[PDB]
Design a protein around this ligand. Structure first.
Ligand SMILES: CC(C)(COP(=O)(O)OP(=O)(O)OC[C@H]1O[C@@H](n2cnc3c(N)ncnc32)[C@H](O)[C@@H]1OP(=O)(O)O)[C@@H](O)C(=O)NCCC(=O)NCCS
Ligand SMILES: CC(C)(COP(=O)(O)OP(=O)(O)OC[C@H]1O[C@@H](n2cnc3c(N)ncnc32)[C@H](O)[C@@H]1OP(=O)(O)O)[C@@H](O)C(=O)NCCC(=O)NCCS
Ligand SMILES: CC(C)(COP(=O)(O)OP(=O)(O)OC[C@H]1O[C@@H](n2cnc3c(N)ncnc32)[C@H](O)[C@@H]1OP(=O)(O)O)[C@@H](O)C(=O)NCCC(=O)NCCS
Ligand SMILES: CC(C)(COP(=O)(O)OP(=O)(O)OC[C@H]1O[C@@H](n2cnc3c(N)ncnc32)[C@H](O)[C@@H]1OP(=O)(O)O)[C@@H](O)C(=O)NCCC(=O)NCCS
Lengths: 152, 152, 152, 152
């Protein structure tokens, strides 16, 4: 359904989504440039977005993925993930990664449903990389769950 | 609410619950003996059950926990977990553990809500310890998520 | 070479070894009882010792292993490890574990040489379970390296 | 002691070092370009070399480091690592990574001595990414030990 295409021009409407995932606009711009940003449109409305950054050799990661609140929960999330996997294949990558907070129960499900498997956990991650205490779904988000998926 | 008390007598009604979690009745009997089995009643009806087995030094694990299907989703799950943590405290244990399949999204939430933090993952676990392919919530259950919780 | 046999009687000479690995005599006694303690003699002299404790279901761990300083570095270490693996086999265990501090470079080698593979890391472990700062080989020992080895 | 400076010209003498670490010349060229390659000279002789590749956002990794065999073991190894950490700081990175095979006991020590801490293990890594069986120090190298180090 969703029509996804490459992106090169960032505007307030787009930053709104990218900022839903990564609050720090600074860090966003870093990988937004060094990485590939794709935008998904549903007609004329900006549905969602996701960035593919290249990390370790032969390894690529989804450094950011988001869907407009008024349009999420409709299945666009899964479409983007499954799509990022395809862009990653044509990129010749061997393994694709992505990670979120231990509190993000929903995502922990979604990603796995798209083939991702949990690799390891970066303990105290959010504790040392953030000033305040992040909370979500009655859980203290303080660990970075790392997931991966081999393409072969 | 739920009234939990020690258990020493196993009967079909009880095995029904223990088998909800661990299918293998053999393995169950092993830790059922070497471990402490508690039963929770809601009046005269057998609500749920859970076993506390001692693993590493100063470490105890919830090798099994279940709640009657016709009574689960009412909050008894959380009560048992929170209760097992108390039995574990009086047992002088330093850390308490518990782990489930990566597909068990619901549990991954519950346990964390009771303080548990994800430790590490036992990759391909269910692949080598089971013959068939376990599936749940549209996810291929094949990894053993290990969680823990220090008591101090 | 080393002659290893079951043990049931603890004496100062034996505690000296067990305490080389685990300083806390209290914790030692715990698993010393609940676990199986084997002693290795080289003639009439107490060469070394090791304890096999049963942790998770079908899983056994070497909660302690040591060799008299005046006799270590002669290869008795490896013999005990390889021996504990055999006792573990006859015990019908599926997997055997053992872990040490990230600073224990020597052991990280030894164990792997006996088939052990690194599983996961318990970050900050020694930080929360000990009062002082442990140091060894110019490394700040603060992480618990968990290793395992399937028996099949 | 060692004089380290940026590099842009690759010659047989340099590839000799880079290939000591990563045999695959192909993969080397990939990160050799997308990454920053520094060379360390001890007078007029090419002492060693190391490459800083940028992986995850705010994260940089030492994708390759080596020292001329006839000059290693003199402490140049440590100098390069400690130097890569400084180049990484001025690069504004938050965390720096580096990983080697579980068999590389020597490095497991070196890196830790430079502040690196073991993060997680990529099981069966070398089994699926290499055709032959790698061996070293009487150990079957088949796991990728991942280390990291926060810069703040
Ligand atoms: C993460 C995100 C992109 C994906 O969004 P999404 O639209 O919410 O998720 P989807 O609707 O596409 O998920 C589909 C799965 O979840 C399940 N699901 C749908 N509604 C559900 C509900 N109410 N409760 C539990 N599961 C549900 C479905 O089973 C579906 O799987 P299926 O296709 O196999 O049937 C969106 O939540 C978001 O952008 N959030 C804010 C930013 C963020 O967290 N970014 C990522 C960090 S880098
Ligand atoms: C996993 C298990 C132990 C926990 O049981 P549970 O009672 O079913 O789960 P809970 O009710 O406690 O779960 C919490 C949910 O119920 C809801 N809830 C809590 N109190 C409630 C109440 N008084 N009334 C209605 N709903 C309530 C919450 O909304 C919560 O969901 P949320 O986290 O999304 O907000 C039980 O599901 C089970 O034994 N299942 C099968 C066996 C198995 O797979 N075992 C493996 C472990 S060894
Ligand atoms: C770790 C320990 C169990 C193993 O004992 P060990 O007998 O002393 O060690 P080994 O002799 O088998 O060790 C092999 C090393 O000695 C060297 N060595 C020298 N001569 C040797 C010989 N003739 N045969 C075998 N190794 C020899 C090797 O270089 C080898 O190095 P490597 O491990 O890097 O490969 C023992 O050192 C000990 O108990 N130390 C203190 C307590 C402790 O750390 N306990 C474990 C905590 S759970
Ligand atoms: C990794 C490498 C660059 C560094 O080389 P190096 O010169 O051999 O190592 P160094 O001499 O500089 O190491 C010094 C540290 O290790 C320690 N060390 C020395 N001998 C040791 C031993 N036998 N066992 C454990 N530690 C030892 C020292 O403590 C020293 O630290 P210190 O000064 O604080 O006391 C070199 O080994 C190499 O190029 N190897 C092959 C390629 C490879 O595998 N590269 C990495 C893949 S990413």
């Amino acid at each position: 359904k969703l029509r996804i295409e490459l992106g090169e021009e960032t505007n307030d409407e787009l930053y709104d989504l990218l900022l839903l995932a990564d609050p720090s606009k600074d860090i966003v711009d870093e990988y937004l440039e060094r990485g590939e940003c794709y935008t998904a449109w549903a007609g004329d409305e900006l549905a969602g977005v996701y960035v593919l950054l290249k990390t370790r050799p032969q390894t690529v990661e989804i450094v950011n993925i988001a869907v407009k609140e008024s349009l999420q929960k409709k299945g666009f999330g899964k479409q983007l993930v499954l799509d990022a996997i395809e862009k990653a294949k044509k990129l010749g990558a061997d393994t694709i990664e992505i990670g979120t907070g231990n509190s993000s129960i929903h995502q922990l499900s979604l990603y796995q449903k798209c083939g991702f498997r949990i690799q390891a956990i970066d303990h105290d991650f959010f504790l040392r990389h953030y000033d305040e205490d992040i909370f979500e779904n009655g859980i203290q988000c303080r660990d970075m769950v790392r997931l991966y998926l081999d393409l072969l």
